[PDB]
Design an enzyme around this catalytic site. Structure first.
Site, PDB file in Angstrom:
ATOM      1  N   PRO A  14      17.342  53.650  38.113  1.00  0.00           N
ATOM      2  CG  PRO A  14      18.943  55.275  38.570  1.00  0.00           C
ATOM      3  CD  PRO A  14      18.516  53.903  38.969  1.00  0.00           C
ATOM      4  N   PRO A  53       6.278  48.013  26.049  1.00  0.00           N
ATOM      5  CG  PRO A  53       7.173  47.901  23.902  1.00  0.00           C
ATOM      6  CD  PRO A  53       6.798  48.884  24.970  1.00  0.00           C
ATOM      7  CB  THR A  54      10.086  48.149  29.378  1.00  0.00           C
ATOM      8  OG1 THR A  54      11.016  48.212  28.301  1.00  0.00           O
ATOM      9  CG2 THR A  54      10.856  47.941  30.673  1.00  0.00           C
ATOM     10  CB  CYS A  94       4.628  59.696  29.215  1.00  0.00           C
ATOM     11  SG  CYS A  94       6.152  58.758  29.531  1.00  0.00           S
ATOM     12  CD  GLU A 135       1.734  57.004  35.860  1.00  0.00           C
ATOM     13  OE1 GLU A 135       1.503  57.638  34.804  1.00  0.00           O
ATOM     14  OE2 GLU A 135       1.042  57.121  36.894  1.00  0.00           O
ATOM     15  CG  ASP A 171      23.147  61.621  32.539  1.00  0.00           C
ATOM     16  OD1 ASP A 171      23.652  60.865  31.677  1.00  0.00           O
ATOM     17  OD2 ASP A 171      22.721  61.222  33.643  1.00  0.00           O
TER      18      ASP A 171
HETATM   19 NA    NA Z   1      23.352  60.263  29.331  1.00  0.00          NA
END
Ligand code: NA
Ligand SMILES: NC(=O)c1ccc[n+]([C@@H]2O[C@H](COP(=O)([O-])OP(=O)(O)OC[C@H]3O[C@@H](n4cnc5c(N)ncnc54)[C@H](O)[C@@H]3O)[C@@H](O)[C@H]2O)c1
Ligand SMILES: NC(=O)c1ccc[n+]([C@@H]2O[C@H](COP(=O)([O-])OP(=O)(O)OC[C@H]3O[C@@H](n4cnc5c(N)ncnc54)[C@H](O)[C@@H]3O)[C@@H](O)[C@H]2O)c1
Ligand code: NA
Lengths: 496, 496
Positions: A181, A236-237, A290, A255, A94
């Site tokens: 998520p 920005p989010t 981060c 965070e 993923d």
């Molecule tokens: Na993915």
């Protein structure tokens, strides 16, 4: 494989999104569509909030003891360890994360659940705290209780782990959570839903909504019955979420990213040990961290020799398919991120900076969002590469002579997440601990953390702390209970 | 009475605003202009932030111990007590607060500075907290340091007291504070500046910017170098401040209004004791109290008997100029508030509610923003009077038969600040402590609080807690310090 196909996890059941939309799962190593996830909208958020409200009001969840919740947390942890190899494979497929890193995340997940299970077991004895007052007419205490319905919006860089950093303390505190998520990495979070089904987690205690940020995350932020938002992701989010929460005077924790410095002094004992910590602080997780120590500030006496060892260690990083057990560098998560990272590297070239190594895609890998580990030198403070978070395996370097110059360069950022100091000098390390304008300081390393410690930053890196006692306390409502015990009237007003 | 004429208090000096604007001081009892205050703008904010940063960087503030800061706090407390009669008269003249209530606020200011001086002394011993890790290669600790530059935006209802609730913990934590008091009541806060100068408080440690909300408060919330905003006031202003702070991902705390209930049961021991507590919870400070118990929820068996005692005590309240002896009710703070309060009363009448007493300006007072204490009955839950905070001396009343109905009515609000239960039944009072959806619960009283207790609400009343250890911790930056003690390489990467 195989790649699971799930619906939304709401009120203990698998639920198709109201609008019935789906969005793809792309493997970033191969660029192949490997499946799809449900794309939730506001109508699904509303259903999830009603389900979480129902949990808080029900005896099954809202009236549980901390000991009872600790049992659920441990059962989730044991199912994660049972499914470890399968979940780590899915995490890599993923996100592009190496299998080795994916497996380490799974162990961190189990450890996080176990840490919070222990705190949930201690929680009830601290529910009521008597308070000393300089009065004989009043009796007071502090009562701690679950905050209520919480929205947890998490990122794709540690898909399951970042979700657990929020989920484990929210459930430990007795809240009912709605987890949202990232649409770039939702497989393991949807598998958490299946795990909660298997362990019989009470209906609505945890609700998992996958979908696009504005469509599924946004309604959570503006919902009238969400008591708090806990967010990890981009600045920005974060600003958008906090703006939306402001309309309902709803608390939020943010965070956000960083541009963390690693300061290397000439008194370091071993160049290879310090160079390895530098690689780890920037290339691990393909730099999608981060707190990554993205700016190397190196003392001029060792700069040349340290840069040599750094370049040699860097060119030895195995870049390959993430499922290979010895892979050290996976691709970035998406095409969008691949383009963003290559643009930062090209803008650095066009500003006069030097590409000491990397900056291209590997020769042997024709498919996948692979970016070579990149070391950028001849950097000045006005450059975009120095100021902005790249979120790629990109390190920029500046030299210094004096400790004062190093602190000034270290603090020359709008961010304030982490920082590292590499030096044998104990008093110097303590001066940096105070001087670094951050929430995290590493001494003679870069990146390691433990569940017992508070995690978070300051300045443009946000506010609030994850983990330790802070993680759980973020999810409690605090009440003052004050009782008048005297039989006497108040005698403020004139009796009629 | 002499009214002081002051400038802005910045970097230890009296400073004229850059644009040299001043705004009037109005006495709410007489409606007369009694002086003027400086009107700070964005250029003054910039100067105050620079002065605050200089204090953080200076050894005489930014390098002080908690014991050193405690000495200044106690010196401010001593000066407030020496000047109590003067400051209390000024507070009444400015705000309309009764002299007796103004005097009580000055005792509480001294007490608040004293409690925080105590906390500042204990702060040094908790600066560095070693954390046990079950590791042989790492050593970690928690470092607590001042958060930095803090903007404190306070309301007119407790002019000096509400300023001190924020200033005392900010100075105890070692922050450099910028106080922005309400343009409606700034006299005492400017006098605080004079006291700080008299006690030799280090330059930039406290900066006082008087002025209009959008002009002086606004730039503080959007400032790049302000680490945090602490706000107490209205929900709409709270929303605007948090919106502005969101663009710079800046943390904020919001202490907003409420529509707090007082639940009276038929087992109360004394009707007159409970009736006086009810007057106190709604009429004291002319109802200009965030936590006022503005909704009376009374058991139907005692309703008539209790309301009769309530009317008799209410009609016995002396309404006069607040400087007079035995004044039990002063005017509201301003023309705007007066009109707003009278508009809520006229809207309740338009909705079919009954004005049991008051509802008008008093006959004997031709001038001043005087509103009679008002009791509103025949209220339904759909009415504006039940739903909205009036911030006036206005009580609305509903009856109940059962405990289930009392709880439903008590929680039937978008707010969640305080709540009171009046009952001799211990187990019932315990059930209400849990059931009330608030941050504060009073048992057999309404309004008393202590410095040792967390103060704040939930839902639309906001988030964060003032006072106690919470007040101090709000102003600390938490740092995780993780050191690698091993001489061994990390051994994650392959040596070249
Ligand atoms: Na993915
Ligand atoms: O991906 P990325 O690397 O850009 O990180 P990001 O900061 O945009 O994403 C972090 C999380 O926030 C969500 N999000 C994105 N936009 C949102 C919005 N407007 N409102 C609410 N949640 C939102 C994402 O879906 C993800 O779960
Ligand atoms: O109305 P009310 O005065 O009764 O209470 P209020 O909520 O408007 O005022 C509380 C405090 O906030 C300030 N304020 C008002 N508007 C502001 C803004 N846009 N930005 C920042 N601070 C602002 C006021 O001056 C006061 O100090
Ligand atoms: Na005034």
């Amino acid at each position: 494989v195989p790649i699971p196909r799930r619906q939304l996890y709401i009120g203990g059941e698998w639920r198709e999104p109201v609008k019935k939309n789906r969005i793809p799962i792309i493997n970033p190593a191969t660029e192949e569509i490997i499946g799809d996830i449900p794309a939730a909208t506001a109508e699904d958020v509303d259903i999830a909030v009603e389900a979480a409200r129902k949990a808080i009001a029900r005896d099954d969840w809202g009236s549980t003891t901390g000991a009872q919740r600790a049992k659920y947390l441990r059962a989730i942890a044991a199912k994660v360890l049972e499914k470890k190899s399968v979940l780590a494979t899915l995490e890599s497929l993923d996100s592009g994360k190496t299998l080795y890193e994916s497996a380490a995340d799974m162990d961190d997940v189990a450890g996080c659940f176990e840490y919070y299970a222990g705190l949930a077991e201690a929680l009830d004895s601290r529910r009521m705290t008597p308070v000393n007052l300089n009065s004989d007419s009043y009796k007071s205490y502090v009562l701690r209780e679950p905050l209520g319905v919480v929205g947890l919006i998490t990122p794709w860089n540690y898909p399951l782990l970042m979700a657990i950093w929020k989920v484990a303390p929210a459930l430990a505190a007795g809240c009912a959570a709605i987890l949202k998520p990232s649409e770039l990495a939702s497989i393991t979070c949807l598998e958490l839903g299946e795990i909660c089904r298997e362990i019989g987690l009470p209906s609505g205690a945890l609700n998992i909504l996958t979908g696009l940020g504005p469509e599924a995350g946004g309604p959570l932020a503006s919902h009238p019955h969400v008591d708090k938002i806990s967010f990890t992701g981009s600045g920005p989010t974060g600003s958008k979420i906090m703006t939306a929460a402001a309309q309902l005077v709803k608390p939020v924790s943010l965070e956000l990213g960083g541009k963390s410095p690693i300061v290397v002094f000439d008194d370091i004992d071993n160049l290879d040990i310090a160079a390895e910590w530098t690689l780890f602080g920037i290339f691990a997780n393909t730099g999608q961290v981060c707190s990554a120590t993205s700016r190397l500030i190196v003392q001029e006496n060792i700069a040349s020799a340290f840069m040599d060892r750094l370049l040699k260690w860097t060119k030895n990083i195995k870049i390959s398919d993430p499922l290979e057990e010895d892979c050290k560098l996976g691709p970035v998560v998406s095409a969008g991120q691949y383009e963003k990272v290559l643009k930062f590297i090209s803008n650095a070239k066009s500003e006069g900076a030097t590409i000491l190594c990397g900056g291209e895609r590997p020769q042997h890998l024709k498919k996948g969002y692979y970016v070579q580990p990149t070391i950028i030198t001849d950097v000045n403070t006005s450059m975009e590469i120095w100021k902005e978070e790249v979120f790629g395996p990109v390190l920029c370097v500046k030299t210094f002579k004096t400790e004062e110059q190093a602190i000034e360069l270290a603090n020359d950022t709008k961010y304030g997440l982490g920082a590292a100091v590499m030096s044998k000098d104990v008093k110097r390390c303590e001066r940096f601990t105070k001087a670094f304008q951050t929430g995290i300081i590493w001494i003679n390393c870069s990146q390691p953390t433990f569940n017992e410690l508070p995690w978070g930053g300051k300045k443009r890196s946000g506010f609030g702390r994850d983990l330790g006692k802070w993680g759980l306390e973020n999810f409690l409502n605090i009440k003052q209970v004050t009782e008048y015990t005297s039989a006497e009237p108040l005698a403020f007003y004139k009796s009629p």
